[PDB]
Amino acid sequence: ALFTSLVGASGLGFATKFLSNKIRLKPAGYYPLGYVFSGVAWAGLGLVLHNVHQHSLEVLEKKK
Amino acid sequence: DILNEEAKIVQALNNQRELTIKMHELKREEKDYAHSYSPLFSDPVPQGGSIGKAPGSSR
Amino acid sequence: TAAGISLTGGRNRCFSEWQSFMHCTAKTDAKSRAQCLPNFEDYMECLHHTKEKARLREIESVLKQK
Amino acid sequence: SSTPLVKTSVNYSYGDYPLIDADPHFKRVVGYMRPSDYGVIGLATAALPAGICFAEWLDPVKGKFARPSVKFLRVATMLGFAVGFGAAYARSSLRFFGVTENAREYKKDEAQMAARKAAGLEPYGTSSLTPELQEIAAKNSAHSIAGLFIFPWFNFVNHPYHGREQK
Amino acid sequence: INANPGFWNGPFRYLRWSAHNRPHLFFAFAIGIAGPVAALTLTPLRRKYLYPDHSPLPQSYPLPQRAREGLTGFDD
Amino acid sequence: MYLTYYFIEITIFLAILCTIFIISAKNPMVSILYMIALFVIAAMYLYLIGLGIFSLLYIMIYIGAIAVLFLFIITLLDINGNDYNTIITQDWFNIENTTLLTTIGNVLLTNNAFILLVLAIVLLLGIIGPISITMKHK
Amino acid sequence: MFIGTIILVLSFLGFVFNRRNIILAFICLETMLLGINLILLRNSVLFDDISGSLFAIVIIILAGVESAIGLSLLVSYYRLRGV
Amino acid sequence: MLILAIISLITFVSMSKLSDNRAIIRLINIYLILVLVLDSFLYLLFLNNQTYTVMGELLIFNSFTFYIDMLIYFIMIVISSLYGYNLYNNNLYKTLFEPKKELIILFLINILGALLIVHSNDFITLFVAIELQSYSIYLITAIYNSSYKASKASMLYFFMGGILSILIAYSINTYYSVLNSYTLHSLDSLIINTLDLNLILIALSLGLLFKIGIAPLHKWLISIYENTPILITIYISLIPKISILSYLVLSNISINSLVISILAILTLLVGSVGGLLQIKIKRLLAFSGLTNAGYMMLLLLLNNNEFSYLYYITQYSISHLAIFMIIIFSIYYINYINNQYNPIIYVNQLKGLIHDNAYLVLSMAIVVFSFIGIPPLLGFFGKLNILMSILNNGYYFISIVLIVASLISALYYLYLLNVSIQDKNNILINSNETVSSVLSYILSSLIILITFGFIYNSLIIDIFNVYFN
């Protein structure tokens, strides 16, 4: 499922902002808008990577 | 019901095993020249350095 | 590249021996390259003439002997 | 001045789609790119100055949110055109390989080839070279869209052979 | 003083300015830029207007592609 | 004309003589003074082997730039059984004296032009590096 | 094949046992770049091509740029010292 | 598009002042990002390990090398991103880590040098590119000129680079002295039967390898990697590794090598025990850099190892890269700073890092667990798949000396954590300034990659199966 992969990749981005605040000695929620940006970009990779994997599978199916 | 579920799972794993073992054979398979080197220029015949060339060099 | 080139840009000493080897390889898959061996050895005699030097030192030894 | 006299693969595809050419000439790549391709150029040209304004909004250089010099914007515009053109050439010449969607250009190359067959001239045009140099220059430009990451290289040659059916 | 206006404020003025103050750069650069631009644009014109190219010089003995016919004469 | 035969075996020994004076020298500059002679013996060996081209190439570039470069730096201190004659034929296939230098200019430019193109970046680096080090901009 | 081998090997032995003179290391290295030539050049000669000469002109150039770069490295090594 | 960057940017730097040095590197950062993003699709240029030979039998572009070709841009984005961004807006971090004028030029020259090895078919392009990257590292060591250890290390690197220059050239010369090629179609499992090309290709391998820290030639790279400044070493202990190792793994010129196997054993052994009694952190870190290349020597021996190589590369070029940036962060909290070029040396100095934050410590802890193969980490499956390639072809004693090396390694990796979580007696309560956001966000990214990298374990295997075969 594509959407379930997207949720996990955006959760990875949520963790990126969450970690970066804790090195910056900020609180957990310090700059909330950044959680959106990281929420997209990593999810965008899950956009791309799954689009890779779709395009992988069909190639195998065309060799039978 | 549980045996049907495990039939699906064990057949999925045997599909996985017979996927990978075949893919390992697909690794060690002899590759053609078209895949290995440049697709066009299908011969490896060099025929290079043609200015002072002599008729009869091919064999 | 500079594969079969020469000093004057023509073909070298063993171009033929090279190309007859490459003709030996372009028609031949691996696990059948063994028949390609005398085509290869004919190339090697071009480069270093080891069979030729072995041919000539024996007859030179015979000429020295008499 | 049109005999290839080398052994070239014929219609040897690169994906699931039919090919056209092994190296499209540089004028042709301009002549066949889709209208969605020019948007990639334009958005890449906009990406670099927006990128620098972004990067200073994230962390400024000297602690002050200040927009950079116009000199940086002009040079970022130049390199944005560089990235957009590299992307344009890269996205366009796949379709000659039959590796992405080859729908309209396979039609257009059933046209322009047939347009110049009936016009009686060469199917690609005469280059100003001896055919051995045509071979060697095309050996330089063969598959050279790969490694676009390292260096740009193109086909300015107009040599005869292209991985066509027969000519 | 002739310090700088900048190339990216007004181009053609800056070209005039460099030609008045630093011709060592700009008149090497003009000869340099006149090379490849003229090399691109003039060579279609010469084939169209002045005269076309030359026949290529042969580099070896030219070999035709025939089938060794019966050629008589000079047996003995 | 039998003195003619051992020419090559002259310059080999004179090479072996010379290198010992490289790695046995009091001053630094005495060593490079032997080294330029080693370049000259090398160039005579190239003329004697049958490459009269590269003999003079080396004189242009070895004792041209790089030796004189070494001299220029070292000034700046403060205070101190194969015995078989090979047979050579004569063929008439060549038509014009495309010598060794021509065919270098063909292979560097057609068959392997990318090597010269990256060599441009090597020569670029030769410019940037000394200006990257020995300047201290502002 | 003798002369390039002997120049290379004596330059190598000169590089090893003569560290504490540092310019001597450079010039032994430079003669190494000569010795690789003296073997390769005659391999072009004996093998009827300029393909070895193709590599040879490049390694001439690279020996040059080596002497260009590393001697500026030397000047950096002595600017921060006095002698 | 490297050259298309370089030819513009050196004109740009020459036409620039000295205060633009951060902003040029910010430009090149964003530039390489957009090179990766807007042109990523060239993995589509093959489907069945379809390999291109470009510029006429000279370069080789394939299924494999495209990955490393992407990887070097990915790491260079990080290295550039160190420069272009401040750490803090302090007086200290502007007399530290201020780049020179010519530095960012030399990087793209080096990346040209690194890529023209991995893509090289010819020995001549190999030789040009190893000279290119050798000159690169000569300058990049020597560029921070006003440090005595810097220039001394530049000379030290220089002479061994000259020996390996002439040694690789002598190997190419000897291979040409027996054969009239320079390419590698001339091997093809037929001449290997009937000609002793063992010793010559072995001598090629050794000359290529001894620019790594291969254990006969052992101390000198370590002396460099401490005498360099703390910044340059995070670049020059990475690029000469993954460039030539990708070459050597691409063409398996020494298969069942008696020499390379014994040197691999000795490499792992002396690197693991050389990490032991050391209090200088650049040392310790460089010996980690040695033993991981020890594993690389193992992957040189095999046949058809494009999985375990590339996976351990993207392991190593993240973990080894990131632990530097962690101790680059860590020098703010320490109590004693010498040596403007090289602030931290002694591993004692980060004695109380957990009472400064928990989270830089946790991020340090997982990456130092990533060097020792802790199973929920990305650093683990590297060693796992190495061993899935090792006993694939019967390097049994190699496997058990790998285990010995892994244990003796993991002894000294934990020494960082032995230091890092202790008492400090003088704890931070309030810093004025924060760390520059996206610079630290890169480290957050690089560490969620290592922790949550077993997620895409399955998908990378599928991409491996479809694309690389």
Curated annotation (Swiss-Prot), chain F:
Per UniProt, which keywords does this protein have?
A: Electron transport, Membrane, Mitochondrion, NAD, Respiratory chain, Translocase, Transmembrane, Transmembrane helix, Transport, Ubiquinone
Q: Name one GO molecular function term.
A: NADH dehydrogenase (ubiquinone) activity
Q: Which domain of life is it from?
A: Eukaryota
Write down the EC number.
Answer: 7.1.1.2
Q: Any stretches that span the bilayer, and where are they?
A: 3-23, 32-52, 53-73, 113-133
Q: What does this protein do?
A: Core subunit of the mitochondrial membrane respiratory chain NADH dehydrogenase (Complex I) that is believed to belong to the minimal assembly required for catalysis. Complex I functions in the transfer of electrons from NADH to the respiratory chain. The immediate electron acceptor for the enzyme is believed to be ubiquinone.
Q: Where in the cell is it found?
A: Mitochondrion membrane
The record's subunit annotation is: Complex I is composed of 37 different subunits.
Upper classification of the source organism reads: Eukaryota, Fungi, Dikarya, Ascomycota, Saccharomycotina
Which species is this UniProt entry from?
Yarrowia lipolytica (strain CLIB 122 / E 150) (Yeast)
Cellular component annotations (GO), alphabetically ordered: mitochondrial membrane
What does the record give as the reaction this protein catalyses? a ubiquinone + NADH + 5 H(+)(in) = a ubiquinol + NAD(+) + 4 H(+)(out)
Q: What's the protein called, per UniProt?
A: NADH-ubiquinone oxidoreductase chain 6
Instruction: List, alphabetically, the Pfam families matched.
Output: Oxidored_q3
Q: Which family does it belong to?
A: Belongs to the complex I subunit 6 family.
Q: Does the keyword Kinase apply?
A: no
Class in the EC hierarchy, top level: translocase
Tell me where it mainly resides. Answer: mitochondrion
Which InterPro entries does the entry link to? NADH_UbQ/plastoQ_OxRdtase_su6, Nuo/plastoQ_OxRdtase_6_NuoJ
- What intrachain disulfides are recorded? none
Membrane topology qualifier? Multi-pass membrane protein
Curated annotation (Swiss-Prot), chain G:
User: Which residue spans traverse the membrane?
Assistant: 21-41, 55-75
Q: Pfam family of this protein, just one?
A: Oxidored_q2
* Main subcellular location: mitochondrion
Which InterPro entries does the record cross-reference, listed alphabetically? NADH_UbQ_OxRdtase_chain4L/K (IPR001133), NUOK/Mnh_C1-like (IPR039428)
How would you describe this protein's topology in the membrane? Multi-pass membrane protein
Q: Which Enzyme Commission numbers does its entry carry?
A: 7.1.1.2
Q: Which Gene3D superfamilies match?
A: 1.10.287.3510
Q: Which reaction does it catalyse?
A: a ubiquinone + NADH + 5 H(+)(in) = a ubiquinol + NAD(+) + 4 H(+)(out)
GO cellular component, as recorded: mitochondrial membrane; respiratory chain complex I
Subcellular location per the Swiss-Prot or TrEMBL entry: Mitochondrion membrane
Q: Which UniProt keywords apply?
A: Electron transport, Membrane, Mitochondrion, NAD, Respiratory chain, Translocase, Transmembrane, Transmembrane helix, Transport, Ubiquinone
The alphabetized list of GO BP terms reads: ATP synthesis coupled electron transport
Does Hydrolase count among this protein's keywords?
no
The molecular function terms of the Gene Ontology recorded here are: NADH dehydrogenase (ubiquinone) activity
Q: How does it assemble?
A: Complex I is composed of 37 different subunits.
Tell me, what does this protein do in biology? Answer: Core subunit of the mitochondrial membrane respiratory chain NADH dehydrogenase (Complex I) that is believed to belong to the minimal assembly required for catalysis. Complex I functions in the transfer of electrons from NADH to the respiratory chain. The immediate electron acceptor for the enzyme is believed to be ubiquinone.
Family to which this protein belongs:
Belongs to the complex I subunit 4L family.
Name of the protein described by the UniProt record = NADH-ubiquinone oxidoreductase chain 4L
